[PDB]
């Protein structure tokens, strides 16, 4: 139930296809409902969701990169800001270490 995210700058405009974060799981118990999502920051500073993906299946106990493909491409432009949020709304209760 605790979500953490950071702002990402855009250097050159392109089409995004995947997002990555460095995280792992503390215990070896089964986990689910771990989501990585992307938010665009508007002019007013509000965050709008433009994509999300479940990454609980491919997580590993060892600290390793997690790369997940978005459902569809999200065009980005230089000058705007984006946030990659990890949600971790799991049901079993195993914590996530980022």
């Amino acid at each position: 139930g605790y979500a953490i995210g950071g702002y990402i700058g855009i250097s050159d405009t392109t089409i995004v296809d995947t997002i990555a974060m460095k995280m792992y799981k503390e215990t070896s118990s089964a986990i689910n409902n771990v989501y990585l999502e992307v938010f665009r920051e508007d002019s007013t500073g509000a965050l709008t969701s433009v994509g999300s993906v479940d990454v609980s299946g491919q997580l590993t106990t060892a600290s390793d990169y997690v790369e997940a493909t978005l459902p569809a491409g999200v065009i980005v432009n230089a000058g705007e800001r984006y946030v990659v949020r990890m949600r971790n709304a799991t049901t079993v209760g195993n914590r996530v270490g980022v």
Binding site: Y7, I8, G9, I10, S11, D12, A78, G79, R81
Partner: protein
């Protein structure tokens, strides 16, 4: 028929003329826009773009 052919050729030349002028204007504007925009500094390097 000779005058009709001259009419057709002049119309074709006018079409080519306007297309070339429009293409030149569009190309130069594309150059200027690409030069104006482009790479911007990321968020961690600076606050400003």
């Amino acid at each position: 028929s000779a005058i009709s052919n001259v009419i057709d050729w002049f119309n074709s030349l006018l079409n080519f003329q306007d297309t070339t002028t429009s293409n030149q204007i569009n190309q130069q504007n594309f150059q200027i826009a690409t030069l104006a925009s482009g790479i911007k500094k990321q968020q961690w390097e600076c606050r400003y773009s």
